[PDB]
Amino acid sequence: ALEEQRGPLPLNKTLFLGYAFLLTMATIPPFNKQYTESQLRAGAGYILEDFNEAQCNTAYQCLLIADQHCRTRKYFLCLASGIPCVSHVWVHDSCHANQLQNYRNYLLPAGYSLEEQRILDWQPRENPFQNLKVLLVSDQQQNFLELWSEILMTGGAASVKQHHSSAHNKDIALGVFDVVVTDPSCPASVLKCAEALQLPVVSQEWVIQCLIVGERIGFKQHPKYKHDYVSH
Amino acid sequence: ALEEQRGPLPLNKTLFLGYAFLLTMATIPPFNKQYTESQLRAGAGYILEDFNEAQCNTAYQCLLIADQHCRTRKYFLCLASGIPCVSHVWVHDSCHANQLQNYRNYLLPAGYSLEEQRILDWQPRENPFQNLKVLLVSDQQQNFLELWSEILMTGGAASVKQHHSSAHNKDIALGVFDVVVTDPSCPASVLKCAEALQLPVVSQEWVIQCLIVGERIGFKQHPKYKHDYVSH
Amino acid sequence: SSVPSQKTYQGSYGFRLGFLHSGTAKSVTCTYSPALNKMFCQLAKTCPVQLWVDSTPPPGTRVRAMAIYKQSQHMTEVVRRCPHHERCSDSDGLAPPQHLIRVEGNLRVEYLDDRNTFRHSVVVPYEPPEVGSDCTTIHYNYMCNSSCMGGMNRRPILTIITLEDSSGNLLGRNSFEVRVCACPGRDRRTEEENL
Amino acid sequence: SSVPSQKTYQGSYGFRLGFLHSGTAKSVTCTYSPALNKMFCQLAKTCPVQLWVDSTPPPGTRVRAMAIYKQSQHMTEVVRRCPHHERCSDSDGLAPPQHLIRVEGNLRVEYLDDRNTFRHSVVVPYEPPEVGSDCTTIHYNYMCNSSCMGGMNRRPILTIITLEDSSGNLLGRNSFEVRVCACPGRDRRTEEENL
Ligand SMILES: [Zn+2]
Ligand SMILES: [Zn+2]
Structure with missing residues (x-):
């Protein structure tokens, strides 16, 4: 059979x-x-x-x-x-x-949408990351910086700057970015800088959810989008 | 034939x-x-x-x-x-x-279940060691430390610390653990501490049985779970 | 690229649709939700649909049934039977193996495979109600599940019921969403709550 | 993924099941245990199930036998003969080699292979009791052991006996557990003590 x-x-x-x-x-x-x-x-x-x-x-x-x-x-x-x-x-x-x-x-x-709480069918969509300037912060080349950089770019992003969490000296212009995509290994200096520059900081889940829904979603419409959210 | x-x-x-x-x-x-x-x-x-x-x-x-x-x-x-x-x-x-x-x-x-005293059929189950924090103690890298560390982890453990019985200086935090999986070569200092810290201590038969039954069972529901249990 | 019209048109005969009561048992083969205007039913099971009219349509009138996708993004797509079920002997000889919707109990059924649109449809002659009854009842069969990979593939569908004169001209139209599934009753309750 | 129903349903005819008493000798071929509502029997040995009713069902009525696994984790899996035994000449021709349950003595026995559920069933026409007797006795044969690898594989089962009208509509239902084994009586005693 x-x-x-x-x-x-x-x-x-x-x-x-x-x-x-x-x-x-x-x-x-x-x-x-x-x-x-x-x-x-x-x-x-x-x-x-x-x-x-x-x-x-x-x-x-x-x-x-x-x-x-x-x-x-x-x-x-x-x-x-x-x-x-x-x-x-x-x-x-x-x-x-x-x-x-x-x-x-x-x-x-x-995929499974956190906001809709159910599996979503796929439907035609614009590049979800069209003209987005992204700053990726993490302590892993492959798995985060190499991974999301590629996904964001083919998703229509204007630019993605890779910046190794700890092992990197903060000589960038944080004002040029729209969003900071990062995980718990993000240096407090960047978070504090972003907070004052009013530049949103999220976790990879924000990126994934945009890919699933087919559109740019709220930087804060769900807890899992906070870069520091841990299982629990 | x-x-x-x-x-x-x-x-x-x-x-x-x-x-x-x-x-x-x-x-x-x-x-x-x-x-x-x-x-x-x-x-x-x-x-x-x-x-x-x-x-x-x-x-x-x-x-x-x-x-x-x-x-x-x-x-x-x-x-x-x-x-x-x-x-x-x-x-x-x-x-x-x-x-x-x-x-x-x-x-x-x-496999054969001690508690049940009969051969048990396999059935779907959750990871028996999910998020468990284990401390492995023994005088044999291969056969115990390697062997069980790999099985615990594949089974869901959050962490496993391999600690060579004698040949190893006790500069570990016994409070971080949920269990100590060991054998008769376990140093008495570790045992007296675990006791004082209320940290349960068991033999590898406890792990095996968890795998056979499909769930985390009593640390003491059978004599053979005592790490010092000897043939006899 | 034309999506069949689904607008309610009671018409000159005051054409309306009727369904049977069935509650929410899990053994229920077909149940309709007035709240959702959606029938929930199982594979190949009888689906009674009732034709109600205020004036009697002249014999020679027909009743057509056609399925179209409900979501705007798929409306232009033709609804058909998944390949897996096309390769199944359930073929009662009368119905082309590619048709989702079938009619049982009627020997005058015709199957249309529309050369220009490519849509499938099943039509039967209009027959007045039975004496002692206020409505003509047609029994439909949905030959695939809403989840059938290769077929409906999870996409919801609408069944469009058309009342036509012998020359195909529209006399009346109505429609209802359909979900073919394992537990009609269970799925009906689930979706009614989701409101 | 629908598991056939197993709820007792005496129905309008007051359908009940009956079994013969057969102690626990090691020569016994089929023994019933009321305490467990379980029949213990040997491969291909005759297993008498009695049909009791308060009102006589109209002829045309049917009796369907079906096996489903008893444990929840396995209920959706179809009970069938192990391949090893499908490859054995005990095929009385009448019975498809893949059926676990057979009926002996009757000649009107049909073997359903359900195209949608994939389950097996064996159904014979209902016949009134014999004059001088209060019930109709049907003789079932179980062609594999509860332990057959590639078959029941140690998984306990239930036989669901259904009373149906000629249209397939339910009229009655009852059931019993079954262990096909080498030593019926020995196992019966072993399992009754484990209570
Ligand atoms: Zn299909
Ligand atoms: Zn067998």
Whole structure:
């Protein structure tokens, strides 16, 4: 009863030609990332190993393939870049019919919204970070500064300045930024400076929530947006 | 009459594609850990030599294959991390129908429960060690400190401090801990302090049993939980 | 790119819709919420919809049923059966496997696959009420769940019921939101509270 | 993800179930324990279930048998025969090899494989008691042991017996737990003492 859903390998060897795919999963037909990927390659679909908006802009019609909405780096890059998030069931129904299906009937939800308190469907949207000048403050290159800088930029931000929390000497102009995105490792000097400059400071959750809702949301419409909010 | 149960090699080369396996056994169709692993490979199954929740979290649908419930390090890692413990007979039946069987009908028991005095079935559960703060004390890096630190953490612990029994100077804050998991090599100073600090102290059997039952059980509901309990 | 009209038009015959009472049991196969003007029902289960009129429509009149998405962002999208269920023998021979909405109990049903719009619809002849009854009752079947990946895919739909003369000209229209799910009763109560 | 109902429902006919007494010998093939409302029996051995009613159901009525796992964590999982035993010639042809429950002696026995729920059921026509008898006895066969790996796999089950009209509408319901095992009487005693 498992192959049934899965579908066969595409008989038409060029079924996915002209498409690039990015695959991920979270942490309702079980999602077999391996078999799905072989289905795509068997149809000449191109497999991207990591987000790359070069080929996604010129060479191929890129699709993110997953079992449901996720909170991964790749899910975020795609929501921010307008690369559609599609259910792997789309790959399967396409192989089954040896004919490309309308991926608009397989869109995955954008994600769980704190404000709406429920899963939100994905819908067309403007760059959520259009012309935003951001200052990222954290003590981790990869995971924060490298991560969010990329997500903010492809989300239409005008500029993102990376600034290592402790290991960095505050020789920047805080007045040029609209928002400070940071975590608990933010130096008190920056917070105190931002407070007086009236420049809002938030946590990564603020960025994620904007990506999910599809719009720039309140800097303070929810506790998790305070840079210092801890589990609890 | 022995090949009969065994079953053949898969025929279908991609039978287990997208699946990764971890194998163990203790110390009812004889369990051939050799034929089993070769059946798996013939099906493009991925053989994990040692536990790794990296691949188990993002790359493959991981399963543990054994002949019955075990008390090995791998069994414990799987129970602590939610990886299903499945009967090798699932491999054998699958290679037979040349079709994947529902592993949910082949779950091995979680193990023998002291409190219950019987073999207990496995069932979904919350992380048994969620946010627990543990202090590990023993005179053996591998077999105890390494072994349990990894199992506790994968099981949800907030933190685990490894402290070599004798060969280690007590400059730790015993008040930060919730428990002390140790053995008969525990220095008497640590015990007298824990006592005075009301910090409970237990043996590794307490941890094991938590994993078998699926919940954090009484620090003293069984003699064997005393860290000094000796055969006898 | 034209989205079928969904505006209430009681028309010259004073066309209105009627549904059956059913409370909120979990074994309930079809329940309608006046508060939400939304029917909650299960896969392939009978869905009685009542046709009420103030004057009797001349025989030759038809009743069409068509599904359209409710959200503005999807209105232009054609509502259809997910591939998974198209590949299922539940086909009563009469209904094309791609149609979400079917009619049971009537042998004069026709299925329209509109060559220009691409929308699906099921229509039957108008029949006067039964003697001893004040309304004609049509039994509908929704062949997919609102969650079907590849089909409705979680998007809410509206069923549009049309009263037409033999030449297709509009005589009357009404409509109701539909949710096909596992627990109609449970989901009805949940959504009514959410108000 | 709907778990068939298991609530006792004597209904308008006052439907109750009855079982034969069979002590605890180790040669007993099927023994019922009132204390546990549980039948202990052996593989493929005859299991008599008695149907009692206060008013005689109209003929055309039906009796459906179905097994669901008893523990909550497993209720949504479908009870079926382990693959090992599907691969065994005990197939009286009538019975699909994947059905756990069979009915012997009757010849009008049908085997439902439900296209939507995926559950199995076995239903035979209701027949009035035998003259000189107060109840109708149906003989069930359980084709796997509660312990079969790849099947019930040690998971305890319940057999749900349903009285239905010819249209599938519910008329009555009752149920009992079941353990298919090597030593029925031994296990019965063991489980009654564990109380
Ligand atoms: Zn469907
Ligand atoms: Zn069996």
